[PDB]
Amino acid sequence: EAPAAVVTGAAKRIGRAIAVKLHQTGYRVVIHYHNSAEAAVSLADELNKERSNTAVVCQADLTNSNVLPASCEEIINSCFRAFGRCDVLVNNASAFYPTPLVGKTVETQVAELIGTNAIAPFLLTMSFAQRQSNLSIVNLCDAMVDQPCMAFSLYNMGKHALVGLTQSAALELAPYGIRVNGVAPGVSLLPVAMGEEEKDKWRRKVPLGRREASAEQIADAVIFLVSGSAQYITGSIIKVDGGLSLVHA
Amino acid sequence: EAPAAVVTGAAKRIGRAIAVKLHQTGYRVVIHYHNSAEAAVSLADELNKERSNTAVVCQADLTNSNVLPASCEEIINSCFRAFGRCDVLVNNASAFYPTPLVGKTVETQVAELIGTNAIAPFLLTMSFAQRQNLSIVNLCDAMVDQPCMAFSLYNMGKHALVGLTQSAALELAPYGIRVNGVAPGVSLLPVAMGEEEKDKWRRKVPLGRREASAEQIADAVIFLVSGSAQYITGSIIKVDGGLSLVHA
Amino acid sequence: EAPAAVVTGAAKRIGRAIAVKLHQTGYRVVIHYHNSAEAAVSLADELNKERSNTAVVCQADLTNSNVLPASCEEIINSCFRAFGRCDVLVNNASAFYPTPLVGKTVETQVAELIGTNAIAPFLLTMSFAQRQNLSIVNLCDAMVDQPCMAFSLYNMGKHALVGLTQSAALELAPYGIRVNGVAPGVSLLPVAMGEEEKDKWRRKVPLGRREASAEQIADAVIFLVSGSAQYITGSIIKVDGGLSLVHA
Amino acid sequence: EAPAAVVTGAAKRIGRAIAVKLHQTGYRVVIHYHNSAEAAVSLADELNKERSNTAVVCQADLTNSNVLPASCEEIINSCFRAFGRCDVLVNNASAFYPTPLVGKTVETQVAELIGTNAIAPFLLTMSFAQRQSNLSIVNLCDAMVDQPCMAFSLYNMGKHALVGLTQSAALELAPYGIRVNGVAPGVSLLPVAMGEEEKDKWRRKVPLGRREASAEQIADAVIFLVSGSAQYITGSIIKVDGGLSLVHA
Numbered sequence: 006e007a008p009a010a011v012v013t014g015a016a017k018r019i020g021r022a023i024a025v026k027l028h029q030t031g032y033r034v035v036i037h038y039h040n041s042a043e044a045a046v047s048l049a050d051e052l053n054k055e056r057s058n059t060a061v062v063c064q065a066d067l068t069n070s071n072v073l074p075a076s077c078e079e080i081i082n083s084c085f086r087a088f089g090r091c092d093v094l095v096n097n098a099s100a101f102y103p104t105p106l107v108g109k110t111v112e113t114q115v116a117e118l119i120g121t122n123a124i125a126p127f128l129l130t131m132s133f134a135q136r137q138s139n140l141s142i143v144n145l146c147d148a149m150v151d152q153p154c155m156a157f158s159l160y161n162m163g164k165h166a167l168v169g170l171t172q173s174a175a176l177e178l179a180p181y182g183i184r185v186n187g188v189a190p191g192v193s194l195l196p197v198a199m200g201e202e203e204k205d206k207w208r209r210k211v212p213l214g215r216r217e218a219s220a221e222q223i224a225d226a227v228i229f230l231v232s233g234s235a236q237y238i239t240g241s242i243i244k245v246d247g248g249l250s251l252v253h254a
Numbered sequence: 255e256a257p258a259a260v261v262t263g264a265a266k267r268i269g270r271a272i273a274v275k276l277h278q279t280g281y282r283v284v285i286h287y288h289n290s291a292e293a294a295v296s297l298a299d300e301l302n303k304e305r306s307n308t309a310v311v312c313q314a315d316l317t318n319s320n321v322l323p324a325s326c327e328e329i330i331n332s333c334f335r336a337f338g339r340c341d342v343l344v345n346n347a348s349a350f351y352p353t354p355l356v357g358k359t360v361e362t363q364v365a366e367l368i369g370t371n372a373i374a375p376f377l378l379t380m381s382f383a384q385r386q387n388l389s390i391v392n393l394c395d396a397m398v399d400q401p402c403m404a405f406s407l408y409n410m411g412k413h414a415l416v417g418l419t420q421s422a423a424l425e426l427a428p429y430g431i432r433v434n435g436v437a438p439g440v441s442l443l444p445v446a447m448g449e450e451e452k453d454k455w456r457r458k459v460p461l462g463r464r465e466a467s468a469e470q471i472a473d474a475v476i477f478l479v480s481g482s483a484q485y486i487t488g489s490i491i492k493v494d495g496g497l498s499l500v501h502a
Numbered sequence: 503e504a505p506a507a508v509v510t511g512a513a514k515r516i517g518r519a520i521a522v523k524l525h526q527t528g529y530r531v532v533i534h535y536h537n538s539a540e541a542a543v544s545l546a547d548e549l550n551k552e553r554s555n556t557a558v559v560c561q562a563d564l565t566n567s568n569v570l571p572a573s574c575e576e577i578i579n580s581c582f583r584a585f586g587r588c589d590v591l592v593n594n595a596s597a598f599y600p601t602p603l604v605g606k607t608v609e610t611q612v613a614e615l616i617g618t619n620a621i622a623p624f625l626l627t628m629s630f631a632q633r634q635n636l637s638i639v640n641l642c643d644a645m646v647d648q649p650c651m652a653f654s655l656y657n658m659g660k661h662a663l664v665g666l667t668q669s670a671a672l673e674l675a676p677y678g679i680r681v682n683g684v685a686p687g688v689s690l691l692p693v694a695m696g697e698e699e700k701d702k703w704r705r706k707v708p709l710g711r712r713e714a715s716a717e718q719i720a721d722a723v724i725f726l727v728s729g730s731a732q733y734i735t736g737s738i739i740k741v742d743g744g745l746s747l748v749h750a
Numbered sequence: 751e752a753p754a755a756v757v758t759g760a761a762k763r764i765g766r767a768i769a770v771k772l773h774q775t776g777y778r779v780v781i782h783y784h785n786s787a788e789a790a791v792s793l794a795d796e797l798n799k800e801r802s803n804t805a806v807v808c809q810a811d812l813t814n815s816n817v818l819p820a821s822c823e824e825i826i827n828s829c830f831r832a833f834g835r836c837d838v839l840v841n842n843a844s845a846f847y848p849t850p851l852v853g854k855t856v857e858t859q860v861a862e863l864i865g866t867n868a869i870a871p872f873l874l875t876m877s878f879a880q881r882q883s884n885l886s887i888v889n890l891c892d893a894m895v896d897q898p899c900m901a902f903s904l905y906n907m908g909k910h911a912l913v914g915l916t917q918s919a920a921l922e923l924a925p926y927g928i929r930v931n932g933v934a935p936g937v938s939l940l941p942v943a944m945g946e947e948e949k950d951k952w953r954r955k956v957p958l959g960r961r962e963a964s965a966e967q968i969a970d971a972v973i974f975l976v977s978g979s980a981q982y983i984t985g986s987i988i989k990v991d992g993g994l995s996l997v998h999a
């Protein structure tokens with residue numbers, strides 16, 4: 006029987022690439038999304054046309070709040086409801102925008118940037134474990150955490166807390182046979198808002214090929230970590246960055 | 255005149271030691287507290303006996319909430335009001351307790367652990383910078399990569415605090431504000447910890463089989479705020495007697 | 503045409519499993535050995551029974567010395583002479599024994615421990631690049647920051663190997679040669695070791711309270727040389743079942 | 751009885767500043783040097799003019815070889831011979847030059863770069879410990895070890911091995927009360943051979959003041975680590991880089 010995976014923020018870009026690759030490997034998938042309903046449903050439709058009844062969507066805001074635990078509980082419940090099991094969780098959804106130190110309130114920015122990057126992964130990890138073979142969680146981290154974007158303090162804090170979660174959860178869940186790992190892109194799909202000149206500035210920094218990672222290349226590392234070829238790997242974060250993090254200023 | 259420092263959670267233990275050493279170095283000090291009013295005021299009394307009107311207290315809950323930004327703004331403001339300047343911020347206040355993955359609600363645990371260890375430091379940092387040998391020192395944790403079992407939220411908080419230290423060092427460098435950390439291993443053990451478990455921890459420490467005194471932790475803070483650290487920013491100084499080097 | 507790989511110290515244990523898994527994946531292999539001729543040849547004969555003319559052995563001492571550069575050039579040249587190409591280099595061979603600070607001379611210890619773990623990888627890297635999905639995989643150690651007591655030279659050698667992996671990744675990226683590491687925690691235990699001492703290590707590992715098989719270490723090498731890792735360079739994959747996360 | 755310190759490569763630049771500040775703090779000093787004899791003797795003259803019988807020179811090549819152990823033993827012995835004790839060892843001497851992967855032979859480049867940066871510190875640490883209060887060793891590391899200079903592999907390997915030595919020796923020597931720490935400069939005194947345009951490029955990269963560290967600012971972190979205010983600190987490396995290592999490519 007086929008295993009099942011939850012991928013958060015899976016309607017487009019890297020999340021979709023991960024969902025597609027998991028599906029192609031034989032997984033049934035929960036495509037979680039927040040605002041991108043049309044894109045989520047379109048993806049699910051495509052996957053179901055490939056194999057009937059192997060993809061569902063699940064909407065949730067992952068901003069921190071007093072109901073976020075219930076929302077995260079429900080995302081995991083959706084996978085059991087659809088598929089009768091949940092073997093893999095991929096924590097991909099992520100808010101990403103500057104929060105300079107010197108029209109959202111700061112409370113809102115904290116809730117979105119720390120909620121999506123750290124607290125939702127933590128809650129989803131609790132629910133995934135409590136509901137529980139090759140079980141694992143993969144956290145989408147960031148290879149540039151130690152050389153961060155200027156004025157992205159809250160985003161950086163969130164990704165650092167996600168490294169902490171990866172370690173803490175690997176240590177604590179190892180007795181239950183749940184592995185917990187991360188994949189840390191350097192530059193992959195650039196933001197849709199970014200102009201080509203700015204994109205090329207980033208591309209030219211990358212030693213290996215002077216180009217960003219494809220979404221599929223990030224997905225490849227995720228697929229590795231969930232596979233039987235990684236059955237002794239837990240608490241590891243695989244950088245997928247073409248050498249970018251090695252390049253001094 | 256004399257420089258001024260804000261120390262969060264300064265009533266007891268490591269915070270108190272840090273406040274005392276800054277004061278002894280010549281700083282005027284804002285002694286922040288949440289529940290420990292009596293201890294905070296007693297420290298203030300002691301420091302003001304030494305030099306009149308050089309210590310004040312400031313109460314605030316640092317749990318994450320809708321009012322946390324205003325609370326952090328007011329802590330920084332209290333330093334400007336008392337002393338007309340704020341040269342140093344020490345982010346020491348910290349909740350510490352287990353949050354297993356498998357009667358506080360989980361959202362309260364998130365608010366307290368991530369609030370005290372990360373979000374409050376962030377807001378205090380914003381307010382401190384907006385109001386401007388200026389520096390910030392964050393109390394980190396040498397065991398972040400080898401964490402206590404079932405302490406995931408605490409560990410996330412401390413990791414986020416490393417992130418803030420790096421991001422703020424980078425962004426505040428142009429303003430001449432240095433941002434560093436001190437990472438204790440085992441210092442003063444929890445009051446709740448039984449003496450047998452305390453001894454198990456002490457015996458793990460390569461350098462002297464004992465915990466760091468609060469004063470030993472404060473020494474590294476004093477270094478980091480001093481003119482001997484004027485080129486140091488984005489650095490976290492481990493003060494753990496080699497504990498983090500010891501394998502399982 | 504089938505690609506070709508050099509695996510150092512490939513006669514036994516992890517290097518043998520790497521060589522076998524590469525061979526199963528379709529590589530022709532140079533099985534480097536130092537003292538284990540019989541085991542090297544038996545592996546070669548086995549692989550060649552599977553597919554004719556797909557394995558050769560190559561003897562060399564990787565101790566540091568003024569002939570080490572030529573020995574390393576010769577190892578690489580052997581792969582070209584056998585197979586007309588060299589796609590993959592696996593730096594696996596490694597001396598490992600204590601060197602306390604307080605019958606081998608210290609300079610022999612330095613030559614063996616630094617030569618096998620660091621300088622030989624460096625020279626083999628040079629020769630591999632000069633001769634050019636090309637990649638190098640260095641066998642590192644998940645415990646370099648929490649090292650075995652009295653293994654300073656070994657630990658220095660493994661840290662230097664991390665430096666090599668990063669510096670070579672950076673410098674060889676323009677030629678399309680990726681350079682990565684795999685860092686075991688506890689894998690195959692020393693053959694010497696009593697089961698009672700073996701079990702002490704096994705019990706420290708969160709994930710399954712057992713050591714990694716050589717095949718599990720090999721699986722990570724196979725991933726890193728594969729098309730699924732085409733954008734990965736300068737990365738060290740820990741394969742340690744959580745061992746390195748466990749405090750003292 | 752004043753304490754005594756050995757500083758390697760102490761005739762010029764950073765090692766000189768360290769020797770001077772240690773002396774100002776009350777230490778007697780062995781000024782080790784290799785080629786800079788005039789400078790070494792001139793420094794020793796200055797220190798002794800300030801307090802008689804408080805400085806000696808010691809010449810030694812720290813290139814790796816079969817006689818490196820004896821040379822390192824001799825450096826430590828020189829401190830006991832002059833001062834009757836040896837409280838502090840500062841591993842500062844260092845070769846620094848590129849060694850591309852693609853007039854010195856490679857054997858020589860390995861010997862000089864790995865010898866000075868890693869093997870000499872190791873043998874000096876061994877001799878120091880065997881000859882044995884506030885005892886400590888301070889290793890001059892490099893903040894840029896993870897974002898290395900292009901084509902400096904052997905130098906980088908040497909500095910990484912020195913991080914390994916700092917940790918391993920801190921662990922093993924802790925029961926003897928000998929602390930082992932490091933100081934990791936980013937950009938400090940630039941190479942004498944470096945053109946001024948290049949020095950300025952480097953300076954512009956440093957967030958904290960857009961200037962390199964003085965030798966004195968590096969020395970300040972060394973004197974902190976040797977001092978009574980660092981008595982619980984062992985196995986720590988203090989970055990003194992003005993934020994340089996935080997800046998992405």
Ligand SMILES: NC(=O)c1ccc[n+]([C@@H]2O[C@H](COP(=O)([O-])OP(=O)(O)OC[C@H]3O[C@@H](n4cnc5c(N)ncnc54)[C@H](OP(=O)(O)O)[C@@H]3O)[C@@H](O)[C@H]2O)c1
Binds near residue numbers: 013037
């Ligand atoms: N792209 C890169 O170069 C890069 C670099 C380093 C790290 N990463 C990491 O890799 C992962 C994927 O990157 P990406 O660029 O594909 O991500 P992204 O496009 O910026 O965001 C992925 C999804 O996150 C979801 N999301 C945002 N806010 C949310 C909220 N409040 N509640 C629930 N979901 C929310 C969105 O879902 P909806 O669209 O449905 O609203 C969005 O499609 C992220 O974790 C990212 O940090 C990416």
Ligand SMILES: NC(=O)c1ccc[n+]([C@@H]2O[C@H](COP(=O)([O-])OP(=O)(O)OC[C@H]3O[C@@H](n4cnc5c(N)ncnc54)[C@H](OP(=O)(O)O)[C@@H]3O)[C@@H](O)[C@H]2O)c1
Binds near residue numbers: 262269287289394395
């Ligand atoms: N002690 C150690 O061995 C050790 C080890 C590693 C890291 N550290 C770090 O070093 C620092 C000092 O350690 P410590 O053991 O002295 O700390 P602590 O005693 O656990 O806590 C310090 C103070 O934090 C304040 N605090 C707690 N929750 C708060 C809240 N919601 N709002 C405002 N303040 C709150 C409390 O002030 P009130 O009493 O006034 O309520 C408390 O006295 C902490 O950052 C800690 O993480 C310590």
Ligand SMILES: NC(=O)c1ccc[n+]([C@@H]2O[C@H](COP(=O)([O-])OP(=O)(O)OC[C@H]3O[C@@H](n4cnc5c(N)ncnc54)[C@H](OP(=O)(O)O)[C@@H]3O)[C@@H](O)[C@H]2O)c1
Binds near residue numbers: 614
């Ligand atoms: N086993 C573990 O638990 C563990 C843990 C962490 C890291 N690792 C790393 O994983 C790798 C493989 O480990 P392993 O236990 O399989 O290694 P190993 O058995 O200790 O040694 C591998 C081979 O290295 C070769 N070697 C030793 N000295 C040499 C010299 N002077 N010149 C040439 N070759 C020499 C030997 O070849 P001959 O037999 O032909 O003489 C030996 O069979 C090593 O890099 C090791 O550090 C292993």
Ligand SMILES: NC(=O)c1ccc[n+]([C@@H]2O[C@H](COP(=O)([O-])OP(=O)(O)OC[C@H]3O[C@@H](n4cnc5c(N)ncnc54)[C@H](OP(=O)(O)O)[C@@H]3O)[C@@H](O)[C@H]2O)c1
Binds near residue numbers: 758782842891893941
């Ligand atoms: N300068 C920087 O920006 C910077 C940046 C990162 C790290 N660091 C580290 O800080 C420390 C001091 O830096 P620095 O720039 O002052 O060093 P440096 O000037 O490049 O070297 C200092 C001394 O090392 C000695 N030395 C070189 N090769 C030797 C050998 N084979 N045997 C014995 N001694 C040898 C030389 O002594 P003689 O002149 O007597 O021959 C030289 O004066 C070094 O460990 C360095 O790697 C410095």
Ligand SMILES: Nc1nc(N)nc(N)n1
Binds near residue numbers: 100194195
């Ligand atoms: N969420 C997110 N994170 C990063 N690092 N980059 C983009 N484009 N989105």
Ligand SMILES: Nc1nc(N)nc(N)n1
Binds near residue numbers: 348442
């Ligand atoms: N806040 C806090 N953090 C730690 N690590 N230890 C103690 N006792 N308190």
Ligand SMILES: Nc1nc(N)nc(N)n1
Binds near residue numbers: 643691
């Ligand atoms: N070479 C080697 N290295 C380690 N770490 N362990 C064993 N058994 N051998």
Ligand SMILES: Nc1nc(N)nc(N)n1
Binds near residue numbers: 844845892939941
């Ligand atoms: N030995 C040495 N090392 C560095 N990093 N820089 C200079 N100038 N010298």
